[PDB]
Structure formats: structure tokens, C-alpha cells
């Protein structure tokens, strides 16, 4: 008989899932697993990405359970948990979403190993990118295209991605009976005060396949907006309504398939012949996931800077207090702390806001090295991707990919544009909420008068700016010109 596990790791949905269709065909027992260290806080992850985890391992536990199955949580490491139940549960196949993060193909390969001394077929179908990245790199001539431009060339040339693939059967083969690894209590879904966390989550956004099918449909509720979608248009200053899709979580971890998000763009394309084009439409901001998980997978050391080809080599100065400034939300800009403060309660900023955040930190005033705050966003943003945060920290520090280190976004008047009363200040800057639209910007040059019948002195209840923008920008721009020289 055929009895098979389905490993998850990213890819949590049932939804466009290759592996676990595989999984449960002519099977007899299928065991869901999901394998959870008990100790990654004793070696940098905020609750709010973990416990958004959590909740989409409790949502595919509520859609095994509503066909018959139980999701597995298996506590330990995958190279001493499955030589165990391999043998335990007679397992003949293990199958998985492929994955291509320098961790994963170092953990995947000791498997691999694993389940051949056990004689255990492995399956690793692709659908956590549109396409087999290394795929694309062979029709490119073996290279990686290193520009956006040539990549949406060669997908162009390459067709349409796969299709989603269909949904699993309404029944599914459920694990054995009295195998003691799978024993109820050893193998359920923690709480985040279970796995250590003092300080309860804040986020608004909800973890699951469920949550993320649902904001899915609400995106493509207005075909028009889709169509017409242009991303360097957007306001990074929406709160209530964010501008943009929030549908980077659900990427990240799987809950939502890429393949599907394409499938109904095309849908939507077909029928709106004025549709946005790559880079800046939907559709582009997919393909902009793609390229740099395609670079970034072949490229040595894509996370660092030293030993990085594609990395410029950039003399970052070590100035652990505008770090600790920048990171704790006391730079002084109201604009850069609002967003720093989204940053640790949401999880999430529009792209822009990680924009200004960033260029500030880098080659705009601070001259810190990217990867410090690069260090930052991987503990609190709940998207945190590897690929993805480490190339677009490049490209804002115009360390890769982008090298137009004269422009440089005013702390100060990039927001004004958006939101000249200041909305998205007062909502997470609440210090600052009775201050007049005319200094919410630029608190140090409201009269003192101003200061005091608004119950916020500058240098009492917020801080004074850190830095002038106009000195610190210029000395900025000087020394990244003698880099690029
Ligand atoms: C310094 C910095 C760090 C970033 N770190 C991350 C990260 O860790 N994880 C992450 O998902 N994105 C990261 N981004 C990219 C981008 O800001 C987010 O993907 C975007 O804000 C997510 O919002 P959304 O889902 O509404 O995007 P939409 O505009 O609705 O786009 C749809 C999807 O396309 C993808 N996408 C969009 N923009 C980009 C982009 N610039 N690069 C790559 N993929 C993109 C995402 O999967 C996103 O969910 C970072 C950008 C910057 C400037
Ligand atoms: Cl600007």
C-alpha cells in the first residue's frame, strides 16, 4: 500500500498544491506534517510574523479536519523526526513544495538523502514561483537576466506560467490510528504564548488560506482597478484602505498561490484591452517577485555584501546610534517614525513608505549599511522574504540594481504630497495628534507657544530631528559618488 506524507513548509494552502494531490493519489494514509522547532527563540522573529504562522496552521488544520485528515505538527528537526516516522508509518512517498533559499537546499538535500535510505520516493513539484526559476536561467543562456526589462523579455518568450492546479479530492485519506508520533497532544497547533512570546501580537492582518482567498476576491471586486493598476502611483499613506493588494503575507508563506493571482489577471486583462503593462501593473509586480527570486537564487552571498558579485562594495559608516534611532522610531522626522511604527505594530508598509524608511537609513542621511536595516525588517515585517528584502535593500541603497544615488526622498515633503493634514502621522504618531497640519512635519519649527498647547514639546514629549536633512543628504550623495568612481 501507498502511505505518504506531505511536508509543509511554505506553500500552506490546499488550494493550486501539485505535492499534495500527488500525495494523496492511490494512497491509503496520508500524514500532513508541518515540522516546528521548539527553540528559535533561543538562538529576531516578531510575534506578529510568527503567530501570523500560527494562524495559517490553524487554518489548514480546519480544512484537513473538514475532509477527514489532521495537520501534524511535528516538534523537533526534519533530519531527526522523519528517519523516525518514515519507519513508524510505513511511509513510501514524501512530498513537498520545492524551495530555493540557500537554509532550504542544505535541509532539503539531508532529506533527500534520508528518504533514500528508507526507501522512500520523493516528489518536489514547483508552485511557489510562476515558473521553475532555474528554467528560465537555462533559455537565458545558463545567466540570470540582471535588469527588469530583459526578464519580462524572456517570460514573454517563455508563455504564460502554469496553470493552477486543481483542487484536492472533498475526502482525503486520513493518517493511521494509535502511530504514536501522531498522538493528538504532541502534535497540534501552539499558541504564541506556548512557543514563548510575553507580548501579544498587534497586526490587523489574519494568517490562513482562508483570509487570503477572501482579500483575494476583494482586489478583483473592481476589474477596473485592477486593469488600470499602476504601482509608483499609489499613496503610501492609505491606512484604513490600504493602496495596494496586501496579499505579500499570503505570498510569502504560501497561503496564497502566485499561479492563481496570475491566472485571474489574465482573466481580467483579456476583457480590458487598456490594461497597465510590466513593470508598473499587477501583473508586473509578480514578475518583479520572480526576477529577484531567479537573480537572487544563482547569485552567491545575494543577502551580504562582501563576497556578493551584483553588490557594490559601498564604504557604510558603523553608527550604532542612528541605527538604534532609526529602529526605535526617535529620529526626529515625523513621517520616518510613523512609518517605523507601522513598521512593528502592522508588520506592513506600502512599498513607498519602505521606500523613504530606507533611503534615510542608507545612502539618503544616515549611511548606515543596508544590511543592518535589512536585519530590522526581517524581524518585524510578517512578508519578510529573503529573496525579496535583501534585493530591494540594495536597490534603495543604490548598492544593486539602481544607480541614481541623486535621488534622494525628502523626509520631510514626500509625504505632504499624499497627506498634508497628516492623517497617517496622528494615526500612529499619537503624540502628535492635536498639532497643526503646518508643523506635523516639521515639529522643531512650530513656536513654542504652538509646542505647548498641542501637549507636545519637541525635546520633552518627541525628539528633535537627529540630523538636517539638507547637510546630512549632501555629504551622502558626495561619498556615494567617490564609490561609483
Ligand atoms: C526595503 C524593502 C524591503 C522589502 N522587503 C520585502 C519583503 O521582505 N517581502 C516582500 O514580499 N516584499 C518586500 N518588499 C517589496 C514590496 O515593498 C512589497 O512586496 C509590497 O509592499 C507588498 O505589498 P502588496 O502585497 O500590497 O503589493 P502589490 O503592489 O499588491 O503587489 C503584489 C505582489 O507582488 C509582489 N511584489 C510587489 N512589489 C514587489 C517588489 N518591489 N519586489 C518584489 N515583489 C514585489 C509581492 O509578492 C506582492 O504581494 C520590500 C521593498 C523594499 C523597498
Ligand atoms: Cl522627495
Given at each position: 500500500?501507498?502511505?505518504?506524507?506531505?511536508?509543509?513548509?511554505?506553500?500552506?494552502?490546499?488550494?493550486?498544491?501539485?505535492?499534495?494531490?500527488?500525495?494523496?493519489k492511490?494512497?491509503?494514509?496520508?500524514?500532513?506534517?508541518?515540522?516546528?522547532?521548539?527553540?528559535?527563540?533561543?538562538?529576531?522573529?516578531?510575534?506578529?510574523?510568527?503567530?501570523?504562522?500560527?494562524?495559517?496552521?490553524?487554518?489548514?488544520?480546519?480544512?484537513?479536519?473538514?475532509?477527514?485528515?489532521?495537520?501534524?505538527?511535528?516538534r523537533?528537526?526534519?533530519?531527526?523526526?522523519?528517519?523516525?516516522v518514515?519507519?513508524?508509518?510505513?511511509?513510501?512517498?514524501?512530498?513537498?513544495?520545492?524551495?530555493?533559499?540557500?537554509?532550504?537546499?542544505?535541509?532539503?538535500?539531508?532529506?533527500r538523502?534520508?528518504?533514500?535510505?528508507?526507501?522512500?520516493?520523493?516528489?518536489?513539484?514547483?508552485?511557489?514561483?510562476?515558473?521553475?526559476?532555474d528554467?528560465?536561467?537555462?533559455?537565458?543562456?545558463?545567466?540570470?537576466?540582471?535588469?527588469?526589462?530583459?526578464?519580462?523579455?524572456?517570460?514573454?518568450?517563455?508563455?504564460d506560467?502554469?496553470?493552477?492546479?486543481?483542487?484536492?479530492?472533498?475526502?482525503?485519506?486520513?493518517?493511521?490510528?494509535?502511530?504514536?508520533s501522531?498522538?493528538?497532544?504532541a502534535?497540534?497547533?501552539?499558541?504564541?504564548?506556548?512557543?514563548?512570546?510575553?507580548?501579544?501580537?498587534?497586526?490587523?492582518?489574519?494568517?490562513?488560506?482562508?483570509?487570503?482567498?477572501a482579500?483575494?476576491?476583494?482586489?478583483?471586486?473592481?476589474?477596473?482597478?485592477?486593469?488600470?493598476?499602476?504601482?509608483?502611483?499609489?499613496?503610501?499613506?492609505?491606512?484604513?484602505?490600504?493602496?495596494?493588494?496586501?496579499?505579500?503575507?499570503?505570498?510569502?508563506?504560501?497561503?496564497?498561490?502566485?499561479?492563481?493571482?496570475?491566472?485571474?489577471?489574465?482573466?481580467?486583462?483579456?476583457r480590458?484591452?487598456?490594461?497597465?503593462?510590466?513593470?508598473?501593473?499587477?501583473?508586473?509586480?509578480?514578475?518583479?517577485?520572480?526576477?529577484?527570486?531567479?537573480?537572487?537564487?544563482?547569485?552567491?552571498?545575494?543577502?551580504?555584501?562582501?563576497?556578493?558579485p551584483?553588490?557594490?562594495?559601498?564604504?557604510?559608516?558603523?553608527?550604532?546610534?542612528?541605527?538604534?534611532?532609526?529602529?526605535?522610531?526617535?529620529?526626529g522626522?515625523?513621517?520616518?517614525?510613523?512609518?517605523?511604527?507601522?513598521?512593528?505594530?502592522?508588520?506592513?508598509?506600502?512599498?513607498?513608505?519602505?521606500?523613504?524608511?530606507?533611503?534615510?537609513l542608507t545612502?539618503?542621511?544616515?549611511?548606515?549599511s543596508?544590511?543592518?536595516?535589512?536585519?530590522?525588517?526581517?524581524?518585524?515585517?510578517?512578508?519578510?522574504?529573503?529573496?525579496?528584502?535583501?534585493?530591494?535593500?540594495?536597490?534603495?541603497?543604490?548598492?544593486?540594481?539602481?544607480?541614481?544615488?541623486?535621488?534622494?526622498?525628502?523626509?520631510?515633503?514626500?509625504?505632504?504630497?499624499?497627506?498634508?493634514?497628516?492623517?497617517?502621522?496622528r494615526?500612529?504618531?499619537?503624540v502628535?495628534?492635536?498639532?497643526?497640519?503646518?508643523?506635523?512635519?516639521?515639529?522643531?519649527?512650530?513656536?513654542?507657544?504652538?509646542?505647548?498647547?498641542?501637549?507636545?514639546?519637541?525635546?520633552?514629549?518627541?525628539?528633535?530631528?537627529?540630523?538636517?536633512?539638507?547637510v546630512?543628504?549632501?555629504?551622502?550623495?558626495?561619498?556615494?559618488?567617490?564609490?561609483?568612481?
Open positions: 500500500v501507498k502511505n505518504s506524507i506531505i511536508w509543509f513548509r511554505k506553500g500552506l494552502r490546499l488550494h493550486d498544491n501539485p505535492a499534495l494531490l500527488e500525495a494523496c492511490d494512497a491509503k494514509h496520508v500524514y500532513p506534517v508541518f515540522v516546528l522547532d521548539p527553540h528559535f527563540l533561543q538562538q529576531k522573529v516578531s510575534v506578529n510574523r510568527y503567530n501570523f504562522l500560527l494562524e495559517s496552521l490553524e487554518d489548514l488544520q480546519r480544512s484537513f479536519q473538514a475532509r477527514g485528515s489532521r495537520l501534524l505538527v511535528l523537533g528537526k526534519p533530519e531527526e523526526v522523519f528517519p523516525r518514515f519507519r513508524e508509518w510505513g511511509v513510501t512517498q514524501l512530498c513537498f513544495e520545492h524551495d530555493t533559499e540557500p537554509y532550504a537546499k542544505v535541509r532539503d538535500a539531508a532529506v538523502r534520508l528518504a533514500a535510505e528508507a526507501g522512500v520516493e520523493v516528489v518536489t513539484p514547483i508552485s511557489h514561483t510562476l515558473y521553475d526559476t528554467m528560465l536561467v537555462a533559455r537565458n543562456g545558463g545567466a540570470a537576466p540582471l535588469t527588469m526589462q530583459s526578464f519580462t523579455k524572456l517570460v514573454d518568450r517563455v508563455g506560467p502554469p496553470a493552477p492546479a486543481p483542487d484536492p479530492p472533498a475526502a482525503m485519506p486520513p493518517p493511521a490510528e494509535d502511530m504514536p501522531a498522538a493528538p497532544a502534535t497540534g497547533v501552539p499558541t504564541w504564548q506556548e512557543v514563548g512570546f510575553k507580548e501579544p501580537p498587534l497586526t490587523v492582518f489574519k494568517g490562513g488560506e482562508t483570509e487570503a482567498l482579500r483575494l476576491e476583494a482586489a478583483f471586486q473592481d476589474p477596473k482597478w485592477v486593469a488600470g493598476f499602476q504601482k509608483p502611483d499609489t499613496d503610501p499613506s492609505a491606512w484604513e484602505k490600504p493602496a495596494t493588494t496586501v496579499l505579500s503575507p499570503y505570498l510569502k508563506f504560501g497561503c496564497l498561490s502566485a499561479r492563481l493571482f496570475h491566472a485571474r489577471l489574465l482573466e481580467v486583462y483579456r480590458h484591452p487598456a490594461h497597465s503593462q510590466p513593470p508598473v501593473s499587477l501583473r508586473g509586480q509578480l514578475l518583479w517577485r520572480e526576477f529577484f527570486y531567479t537573480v537572487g537564487s544563482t547569485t552567491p552571498n545575494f543577502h551580504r555584501m562582501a563576497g556578493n551584483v553588490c557594490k562594495q559601498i564604504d557604510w559608516d558603523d553608527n550604532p546610534e542612528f541605527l538604534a534611532a532609526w529602529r526605535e522610531a526617535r529620529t522626522f515625523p513621517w520616518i517614525d510613523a512609518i517605523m511604527t507601522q513598521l512593528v505594530t502592522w508588520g506592513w508598509m506600502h512599498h513607498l513608505a519602505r521606500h523613504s524608511v530606507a533611503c534615510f545612502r539618503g542621511d544616515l549611511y548606515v543596508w544590511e543592518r536595516g535589512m536585519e530590522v525588517f526581517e524581524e518585524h515585517l510578517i512578508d519578510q522574504d529573503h529573496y525579496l528584502n535583501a534585493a530591494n535593500w540594495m536597490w534603495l541603497s543604490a548598492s544593486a540594481f539602481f544607480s541614481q544615488y541623486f535621488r534622494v526622498y525628502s523626509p520631510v515633503v514626500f509625504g505632504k504630497k499624499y497627506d498634508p493634514e497628516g492623517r497617517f502621522i494615526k500612529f504618531l499619537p502628535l495628534k492635536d498639532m497643526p497640519a503646518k508643523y506635523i512635519y516639521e515639529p522643531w519649527t512650530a513656536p513654542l507657544e504652538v509646542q505647548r498647547k498641542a501637549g507636545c514639546v519637541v525635546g520633552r514629549d518627541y525628539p528633535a530631528p537627529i540630523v538636517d536633512h539638507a546630512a543628504s549632501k555629504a551622502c550623495i558626495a561619498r556615494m559618488a567617490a564609490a561609483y568612481r
